[PDB]
Amino acid sequence: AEPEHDHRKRMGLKMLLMMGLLLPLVYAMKRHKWSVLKSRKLAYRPPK
Amino acid sequence: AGGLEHRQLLDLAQKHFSGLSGTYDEDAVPTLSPCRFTGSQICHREDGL
Ligand SMILES: CCCCCCCCCCCCCCCC(=O)OC[C@H](COP(=O)(O)OCCN)OC(=O)CCCCCCCCCCCCCCC
């Protein structure tokens, strides 16, 4: 019923390993660019 | 700078600038430290200008 059984699990292992690498690296690229905004500071100086 | 001999300028320096503090200054010299450059941005938004 499922001749692809073994091959799909071998691929599944490779998919998990690549995701364990790519997810934190892509997460790191997101945080890298966004850090400009996440640490920005604002000040309001109206005339008096 | 101008029409003047360097002899004259040195004579006046030794006359009117001799009273300055000597070479030693009691160990309190200003030593300029290096100044960190920071890649950064500052925006003062003012649409009335
Ligand atoms: C005309 C072209 C049209 C293409 C359209 C594609 C549609 C997008 C579908 C995306 C599916 C994700 C991967 C499944 C395959 C698999 O699981 O990969 C199995 C293969 C092992 O294979 P093996 O051991 O059999 O051989 C081995 C021979 N050396 O390694 C992997 O684990 C790679 C998958 C890693 C994790 C996925 C990360 C996704 C990144 C985005 C890339 C998308 C590119 C899109 C290009 C159009």
How were these coordinates obtained?
A: X-ray
Q: Which atom of ligand 1 is nearest to the CA of A15?
A: 32
Structure's resolution in angstroms = 2.7
Indicate if ligand 1 lies below 6 Å from the C-beta of A16. no
Task: Classify the C-alpha dihedral B22-B27-B30-B32 as positive or negative.
Answer: positive
A33 vs A40: CA distance, rounded Å: 12
Domain A4-48 indexed as CATH 1.20.5.100: yes
Indicate if ligand 1 lies below 6 Å from the C-beta of A15. yes
Indicate if ligand 1 lies below 6 Å from the C-beta of A18. yes
Q: Half-sphere exposure of A30 toward its Cβ, with a 13 Å CA cutoff?
A: 6
DSSP A1-48: --TTHHHHHHHHHHHHHHHHHHHHHHHHHHHHHHHHHHT---------
